[PDB]
Amino acid sequence: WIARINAAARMNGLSYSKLMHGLKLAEIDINRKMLADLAVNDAAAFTALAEQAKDALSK
Amino acid sequence: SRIGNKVVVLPAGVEIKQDGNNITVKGPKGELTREFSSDIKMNIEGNEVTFIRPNDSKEMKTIHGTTRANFNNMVVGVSEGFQKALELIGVGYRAQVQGNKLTLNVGYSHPVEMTAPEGVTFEVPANTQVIVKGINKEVVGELAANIRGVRPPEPYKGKGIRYVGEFVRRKEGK
Amino acid sequence: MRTTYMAKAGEVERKWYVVDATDVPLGRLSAVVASVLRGKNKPTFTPHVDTGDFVIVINADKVKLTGKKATDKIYYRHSMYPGGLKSVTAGELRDKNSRRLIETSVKGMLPKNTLGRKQFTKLNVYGGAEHPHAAQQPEVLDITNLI
Amino acid sequence: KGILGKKVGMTQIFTESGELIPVTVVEATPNVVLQVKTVETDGYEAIQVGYQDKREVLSNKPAKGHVAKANTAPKRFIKEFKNVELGEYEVGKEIKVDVFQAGDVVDVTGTTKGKGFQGAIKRHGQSRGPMSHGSRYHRRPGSMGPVAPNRVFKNKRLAGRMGGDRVTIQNLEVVKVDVERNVILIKGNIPGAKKSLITIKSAVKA
Amino acid sequence: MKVRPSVKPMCEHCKVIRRKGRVMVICPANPKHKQRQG
RNA sequence: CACCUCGAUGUCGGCUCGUCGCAUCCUGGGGCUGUAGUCGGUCCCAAGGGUUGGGCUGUUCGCCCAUUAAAGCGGCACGCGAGCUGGGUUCAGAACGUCGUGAGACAGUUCGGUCCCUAUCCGUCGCGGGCGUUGGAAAUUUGAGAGGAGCUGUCCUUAGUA
RNA sequence: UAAACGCUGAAAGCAUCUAAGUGUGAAGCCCACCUCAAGAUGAGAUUUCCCAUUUCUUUAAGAAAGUAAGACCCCUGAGAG
Numbered sequence: 001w002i003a004r005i006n007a008a009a010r011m012n013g014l015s016y017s018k019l020m021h022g023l024k025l026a027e028i029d030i031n032r033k034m035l036a037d038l039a040v041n042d043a044a045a046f047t048a049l050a051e052q053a054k055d056a057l058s059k
Numbered sequence: 060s061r062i063g064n065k066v067v068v069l070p071a072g073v074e075i076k077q078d079g080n081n082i083t084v085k086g087p088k089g090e091l092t093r094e095f096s097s098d099i100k101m102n103i104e105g106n107e108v109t110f111i112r113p114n115d116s117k118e119m120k121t122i123h124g125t126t127r128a129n130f131n132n133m134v135v136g137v138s139e140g141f142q143k144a145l146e147l148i149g150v151g152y153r154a155q156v157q158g159n160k161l162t163l164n165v166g167y168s169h170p171v172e173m174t175a176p177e178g179v180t181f182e183v184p185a186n187t188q189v190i191v192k193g194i195n196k197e198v199v200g201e202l203a204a205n206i207r208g209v210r211p212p213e214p215y216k217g218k219g220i221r222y223v224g225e226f227v228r229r230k231e232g233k
Numbered sequence: 234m235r236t237t238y239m240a241k242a243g244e245v246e247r248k249w250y251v252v253d254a255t256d257v258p259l260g261r262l263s264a265v266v267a268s269v270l271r272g273k274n275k276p277t278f279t280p281h282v283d284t285g286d287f288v289i290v291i292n293a294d295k296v297k298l299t300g301k302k303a304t305d306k307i308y309y310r311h312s313m314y315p316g317g318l319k320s321v322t323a324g325e326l327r328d329k330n331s332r333r334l335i336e337t338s339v340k341g342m343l344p345k346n347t348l349g350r351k352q353f354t355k356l357n358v359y360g361g362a363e364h365p366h367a368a369q370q371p372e373v374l375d376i377t378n379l380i
Numbered sequence: 381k382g383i384l385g386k387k388v389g390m391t392q393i394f395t396e397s398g399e400l401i402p403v404t405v406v407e408a409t410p411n412v413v414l415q416v417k418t419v420e421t422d423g424y425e426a427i428q429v430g431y432q433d434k435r436e437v438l439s440n441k442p443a444k445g446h447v448a449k450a451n452t453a454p455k456r457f458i459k460e461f462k463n464v465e466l467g468e469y470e471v472g473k474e475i476k477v478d479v480f481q482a483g484d485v486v487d488v489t490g491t492t493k494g495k496g497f498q499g500a501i502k503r504h505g506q507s508r509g510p511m512s513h514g515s516r517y518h519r520r521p522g523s524m525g526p527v528a529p530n531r532v533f534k535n536k537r538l539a540g541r542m543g544g545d546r547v548t549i550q551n552l553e554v555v556k557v558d559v560e561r562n563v564i565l566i567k568g569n570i571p572g573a574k575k576s577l578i579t580i581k582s583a584v585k586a
Numbered sequence: 587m588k589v590r591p592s593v594k595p596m597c598e599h600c601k602v603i604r605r606k607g608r609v610m611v612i613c614p615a616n617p618k619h620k621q622r623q624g
Numbered sequence: 625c626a627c628c629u630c631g632a633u634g635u636c637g638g639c640u641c642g643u644c645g646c647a648u649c650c651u652g653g654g655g656c657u658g659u660a661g662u663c664g665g666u667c668c669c670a671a672g673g674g675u676u677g678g679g680c681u682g683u684u685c686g687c688c689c690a691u692u693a694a695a696g697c698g699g700c701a702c703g704c705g706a707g708c709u710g711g712g713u714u715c716a717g718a719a720c721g722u723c724g725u726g727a728g729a730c731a732g733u734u735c736g737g738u739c740c741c742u743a744u745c746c747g748u749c750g751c752g753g754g755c756g757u758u759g760g761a762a763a764u765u766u767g768a769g770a771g772g773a774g775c776u777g778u779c780c781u782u783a784g785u786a
Numbered sequence: 787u788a789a790a791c792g793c794u795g796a797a798a799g800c801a802u803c804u805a806a807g808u809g810u811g812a813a814g815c816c817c818a819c820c821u822c823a824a825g826a827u828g829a830g831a832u833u834u835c836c837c838a839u840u841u842c843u844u845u846a847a848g849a850a851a852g853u854a855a856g857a858c859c860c861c862u863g864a865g866a867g
């Protein structure tokens with residue numbers, strides 16, 4: 001799951017570590033299993049999560 | 060006290076052509092080209108050329124001096140050229156030039172034959188003296204060194220080919 | 234629930250990328266290329282299935298060797314006969330057979346198994362700026378930010 | 381310069397001044413250039429050459445078709461010669477023994493006579509063990525190596541099939557050439573049994 | 587050429603330099619003083 | 625020292641076969657010389673090849689004889705005994721000197737004294753079968769890679785010149 | 787290329803074989819000479835030969851059954867074993 005999430009995060013312009021830190025800041029608790037599932041299946045949903053993580057990181 | 064800072068003049072009608080690199084010099088003797096460093100800046104006056112380095116780092120000081128020396132050598136060679144004078148000493152040691160070919164008899168069972176490149180010439184004012192004359196200091200020195208190494212001087216009796224005037228220590232072999 | 238996605242052979246589309254090695258350090262070029270060949274850049278990555286993309290390396294003759302590696306990095310190989318050790322410097326390999334240089338570097342970074350060797354076959358190295366795989370419609374892959 | 385022939389046998393000849401020298405008689409029925417290989421079509425320069433006309437019943441349609449270009453009968457032996465001037469050769473051209481002149485220095489290639497399974501003593505010229513003094517070690521190939529490797533290093537030479545190998549003898553001399561009989565007399569001896577294929581080429585060393 | 591770990595000048599003419607990462611002592615006066623570090 | 629091996633890891637020398645290290649014996653290159661020349665001395669680079677036939681002794685070693693360009697030093701279970709030998713170590717016999725009252729023993733010698741195994745696996749040297757190499761066939765081929773080879777004397781001439 | 791020797795050349799007005807630049811240099815290293823070699827699964831290349839058949843299933847890189855080019859079985863043998 002970590003590997004797949006990393007690939008998806010890179011495609012969204014972010015590293016896995018940055019994405020997880022951003023999600024923690026944004027209060028997102030979705031775990032790595034669900035994150036990898038979204039990355040493979042629901043690219044749009046994963047992109048929304050990545051946008052929120054980047055926003056939290058910027059703040 | 061710095062070769063890199065010292066200015067270089069353009070005597071007579073020596074001309075210089077510029078380019079991103081690969082500076083060229085022309086004059087009475089001929090043409091030359093060297094790919095100087097991209098960091099040393101060359102400033103050109105009507106007849107004077109100077110070199111500048113970006114900073115005072117070890118590398119910049121070193122390369123500044125080297126480029127200035129190289130450019131100065133090119134100019135002096137284009138104007139007057141360079142000559143290496145060799146004086147062979149021996150009972151039957153002799154040299155003779157047929158055009159660009161130098162034939163040396165220095166005691167070997169066979170004569171030694173040397174060929175100058177188009178940029179160099181051999182004078183041979185006498186059978187015991189040779190002068191390598193050219194435009195490029197590097198090539199002149201290299202050819203002169205090769206001629207000397209054919210049969211370098213020896214200490215016991217002074218025999219061999221010598222650079223004219225070079226000190227050659229001599230041993231009192233019993 | 235056992236719902237993790239698992240890729241299948243042949244369902245996933247493998248693209249074709251062109252990588253320019255001009256003045257890129259050998260190791261860094263090999264690392265990015267190895268990740269691409271394994272498919273680590275795609276969310277569908279499945280360790281037990283090949284899912285990476287083909288890679289074409291151009292200008293292999295211009296790969297970069299920092300330090301004295303051009304003269305000091307030595308590649309050894311043993312014929313398995315007594316005293317049958319042979320060596321060749323990395324610089325000599327770059328000059329004469331650059332394809333072998335890149336391929337050896339990438340082999341070292343791929344897994345040493347059936348899947349790894351099959352993934353390696355998807356590599357294609359060419360000294361020079363032209364390749365014969367125009368039919369595959371490869372796309373440039375900028376790596377300046379990946380190294 | 382090169383040609384293919386058959387090792388007829390061995391004899392001797394008296395040269396001028398009466399010296400006696402051993403010669404090998406090699407017959408070479410005019411060989412035929414069957415194909416010319418170029419950098420464009422094959423990536424290297426060489427000429428394919430056929431020798432020893434073959435009965436039709438012994439040939440195949442593919443073989444007959446291949447020689448059809450040269451417009452000759454089927455050939456038993458076919459070999460490629462390199463390091464020659466392609467301009468001077470063309471499909472259908474013949475090569476005769478007169479290519480070589482007496483006194484030419486040549487390399488002769490053949491297939492060594494087959495000795496079959498042979499022991500190490502004969503095959504590799506190894507030393508025997510003592511034949512007396514209680515010795516029970518006569519014609520064996522020696523030790524197999526040190527203990528430490530727990531194995532035998534490669535090239536530990538042992539018994540096996542001997543001969544039948546491609547061997548070249550360098551810098552032989554063309555004693556004589558008989559064009560009418562298509563014969564070349566080469567000083568010395570050359571590998572291969574009688575009636576075997578032989579390849580004469582201009583010595584590379586020269 | 588004296589190849590030794592310790593290379594030092596022996597007369598005032600001896601000069602210490604580095605070539606190809608090796609320490610060397612070169613003396614135009616006495617060639618016996620010629621030393622390399624090794 | 626006593627960590628593996630005492631429900632056994634055969635122990636010297638020699639023979640057969642070698643392979644490797646370079647701290648190089650010869651050959652190759654070079655610096656310095658208290659290097660005139662011929663010889664050399666010392667040091668540096670160099671492991672490609674080569675580096676013996678005998679007398680004595682079980683011997684290694686060593687001495688000697690005669691050669692060689694040289695007669696290198698070492699590792700590999702002081703390489704190699706399911707490859708050989710068995711001269712020595714060392715069994716049982718017997719004897720000498722010596723020790724012991726003695727049986728016996730060595731702080732020592734001498735003569736004589738059983739060396740087993742049909743190779744399953746890997747490994748090594750050769751030779752086939754199967755399939756693959758993407759229609760089925762007959763030939764000729766490039767060379768990724770690999771192996772082999774790699775030694776050296778004397779004489780003549782240059783010149784009795786330097 | 788090794789040791790070694792340089793040429794030009796500054797750092798360091800000099801000096802300096804090195805930092806840039808450039809060369810000579812060993813029975814050694816890569817070739818050169820000989821042999822093996824595309825199971826080099828990366829299985830390469832060229833020349834030549836055969837020709838798109840029949841039946842049934844299924845759109846099947848389907849199945850089997852006559853063959854073509856060719857090979858082999860079998861038989862006479864050696865230059866091979």
Ligand SMILES: [K+]
Nearest residue numbers: 629630632633
């Ligand atoms: K034990």
Ligand SMILES: [K+]
Nearest residue numbers: 643644698699
């Ligand atoms: K040894």
Ligand SMILES: [K+]
Nearest residue numbers: 654655666667
């Ligand atoms: K010396």
Ligand SMILES: [K+]
Nearest residue numbers: 670671672673
């Ligand atoms: K050696």
Ligand SMILES: [K+]
Nearest residue numbers: 678679680681
């Ligand atoms: K003896």
Ligand SMILES: [K+]
Nearest residue numbers: 705708709739
């Ligand atoms: K035994």
Ligand SMILES: [K+]
Nearest residue numbers: 527633705706
């Ligand atoms: K054993």
Ligand SMILES: [K+]
Nearest residue numbers: 744745746747
């Ligand atoms: K086993």
Ligand SMILES: [K+]
Nearest residue numbers: 757824829830
């Ligand atoms: K093939």
Ligand SMILES: [Mg+2]
Nearest residue numbers: 506507508509
């Ligand atoms: Mg013998």
Ligand SMILES: [Mg+2]
Nearest residue numbers: 528529530531
């Ligand atoms: Mg092992």
Ligand SMILES: [Mg+2]
Nearest residue numbers: 590592593594
């Ligand atoms: Mg001292």
Ligand SMILES: [Mg+2]
Nearest residue numbers: 625626627628
């Ligand atoms: Mg204890």
Ligand SMILES: [Mg+2]
Nearest residue numbers: 629631632633
């Ligand atoms: Mg046991």
Ligand SMILES: [Mg+2]
Nearest residue numbers: 646648669670
């Ligand atoms: Mg050494």
Ligand SMILES: [Mg+2]
Nearest residue numbers: 678679680689
């Ligand atoms: Mg006797």
